[PDB]
């Protein structure tokens, strides 16, 4: 563009979207409204727990939970590790990070936080799965 | 229509230099003549002739080529333009090619080179770069 054109209409940068929108929102119950606040994690209650089939070419029964967060937004959160002790009404902590195989699963359930138990028999990379040091 | 005679002159010089022409005739003006004189003094061109005819006169530049037919003028760039004019201070005068080139400037003390602008401690409108 000409300099005159830039003066008339300045350049406009692309707007960036978050990969974890559900974590950017809190809820005020008194005013019954949403608020913009960045959280690293949010608490939620497992509305459902079960398995999902990944999209091709992968094949599996991937463990996940449908969770209603403290801000009333319902999301799908993957359950990492081998074996879990989660059921409906379990209170879980949810962090960002989607599962590429799973289309609508955009968050992870932290292991070893709130109700969720650490992975049993895990010994390498334990902090990632909430397993205490065996010693 | 025509909007920048200085840009037209610089582009004439650039095109002639590319085609390796020996001489170049263009319509004249005082600013163009001063630019040509600066180029000659600095050694980028060979000779400058003014033809005081009717219709504002003519400038006849003679370009300079070194041994091996190497071009003395590597490039000319219009800096200040009608669409956006550029000025610099004496302490902010730019060096073309780390000093190996000249910046033709227009100052209250006449159109001079960046070296003279720095020496006299003056700024002005940076007309062009030549290297």
């Amino acid at each position: 563009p000409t300099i005159n054109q830039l003066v008339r209409k300045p350049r406009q940068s692309k707007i960036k979207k978050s990969d974890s929108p559900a974590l950017n929102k809190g809820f005020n119950s008194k005013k019954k409204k949403f608020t913009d606040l960045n959280s690293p994690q949010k608490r939620g209650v497992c509305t459902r727990v079960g398995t999902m089939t990944p999209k091709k070419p992968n094949s599996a029964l991937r463990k996940y939970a449908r969770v209603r967060l403290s801000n009333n937004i319902e999301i799908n959160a993957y359950i990492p590790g081998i074996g879990h002790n989660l059921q409906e009404h379990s209170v879980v902590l949810v962090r960002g990070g989607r599962v590429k195989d799973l289309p609508g699963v955009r968050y992870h359930i932290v292991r070893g936080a709130l109700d969720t138990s650490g992975v049993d028999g895990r010994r390498q990379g334990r902090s990632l799965y909430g397993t205490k040091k065996p010693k | 229509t025509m909007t920048d005679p200085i840009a037209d002159m610089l582009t004439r010089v650039r095109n002639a230099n590319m085609v390796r022409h020996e001489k170049l005739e263009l319509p004249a003006s005082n600013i163009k003549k001063e630019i040509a004189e600066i180029l000659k003094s600095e050694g980028f061109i060979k000779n400058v002739e003014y033809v005081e005819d009717d219709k504002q006169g003519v400038l006849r530049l003679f370009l300079k080529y070194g041994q091996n037919d190497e071009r003395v003028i590597t490039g000319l760039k219009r800096i200040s333009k009608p669409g956006l004019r550029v000025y610099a201070k004496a302490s902010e005068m730019p060096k073309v090619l780390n000093g190996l080139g000249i910046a033709l400037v227009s100052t209250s003390e006449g159109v001079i080179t960046d070296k003279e602008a720095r020496k006299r401690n003056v700024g002005g409108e940076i007309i062009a770069y030549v290297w």
């Binding site: 300099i3 005159n4 830039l6 003066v7 300045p10 | 669409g83 956006l84 004019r85």
Partner: protein, 80 residues
């Protein structure tokens, strides 16, 4: 001792009684692209005798508030 700001500008309306609006013209530079762009500011100045007329280039000086939006007084008519 201390002097007050003085401006020069054209008269763009005088329908008000004893008040003329003076358009002072300036050129603010674009902060990023650096181009020179026109900038007009209208000044409401006191014209006691209605001497100034629409069009003439006049001179104004800053004063204390004289009305809701009048802060200047006509000093002289530079041209007409």
């Amino acid at each position: 001792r201390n002097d007050r700001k003085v401006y020069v500008g054209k008269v763009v309306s005088d329908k008000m009684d004893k008040t003329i609006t003076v358009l002072v013209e300036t050129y603010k530079t674009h902060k990023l692209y650096g181009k020179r762009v026109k900038y007009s500011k209208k000044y409401k100045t006191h014209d006691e005798n209605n001497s100034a007329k629409l069009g003439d280039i006049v001179k104004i000086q800053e004063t204390r508030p004289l009305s809701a939006t009048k802060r200047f007084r006509l000093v002289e008519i530079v041209e007409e």
